């Protein structure tokens with residue numbers, strides 16, 4: 001991911017090197033190509049437009065038309081714009097003595113696998129997590145998490161078919177108290193598409209369990225479609241943060257570049273592989289540099 005956009009941006013900027021001062025026409029042409037590169041990377045249209053306008057403002061604010069090294073000013077301005085579009089500053093969920101987080105998303109988003117990856121990540125951080133398979137309709141879905149969780153050395157509590165939210169709360173609360181778990185991760189039911197029934201169940205489970213965080217897992221490869229899912233989930237359930245999976249997937253990187261603008265939700269973690277340790281915090285600044293070939 002980002003490979004296509006990265007090459008287009010690096011080319012647009014590099015082609016200005018060693019040519020002395022550039023004309024306003026050169027700047028406009030450059031800004032247009034950047035906007036086009038973003039658009040072709042499935043970046044939201046409004047975001048792409050706002051992006052080039054910000055770079056334009058900041059570039060002129062640095063007298064790019066006067067600079068003898070315009071390529072450097074453009075790189076510096078695009079870098080800041082990329083960093084901000086990607087989230088600005090790295091963000092992570094606030095940890096308290098006791099925490100209960102919800103993992104929501106569609107089937108195939110990597111939600112379940114991410115739930116297990118998240119448990120391992122915080123386990124290595126000194127936390128004592130407890131995984132909860134909350135799909136009261138799909139036993140096989142619950143078994144998938146138990147296997148994934150126990151494999152990483154994390155306990156997993158499976159809900160029973162048709163079990164009520166109140167019953168789930170009780171059992172989870174007990175197991176957490178007995179095993180002294182400080183981080184409860186609830187893996188909610190995942191379906192191929194958004195269906196009112198499931199959304200209602202999620203909303204209800206949220207009311208009874210009262211999670212302090214609701215992480216929405218999204219397949220970054222779905223591009224802008226992911227932002228549509230985010231809106232639906234936020235409007236019907238209420239999310240606090242996002243997790244973009246398959247960032248290593250061969251696809252455009254428009255989702256990550258539009259998330260902040262479109263959803264207003266921070267991207268906490270990123271999925272970079274299938275392996276259990278294929279999850280790491282999302283670093284806006286670091287990603288911005290990688291896209292511009294800064295290493």
Ligand SMILES: Nc1nc2c(ncn2[C@@H]2O[C@H](COP(=O)(O)OP(=O)(O)NP(=O)(O)O)[C@@H](O)[C@H]2O)c(=O)[nH]1
Nearest residue numbers: 107108109110111112113190245246271272273274
């Ligand atoms: N390459 C790669 N694959 C990932 C990543 N995250 C998840 N996957 C893959 O996505 C596939 C689906 O996983 P997942 O969505 O958890 O399972 P599911 O059977 O769709 N159920 P659910 O969607 O409810 O979690 C798996 O093959 C998993 O390895 C990632 O960051 N990178």
Ligand SMILES: [Ca+2]
Nearest residue numbers: 046047261262
């Ligand atoms: Ca708008």
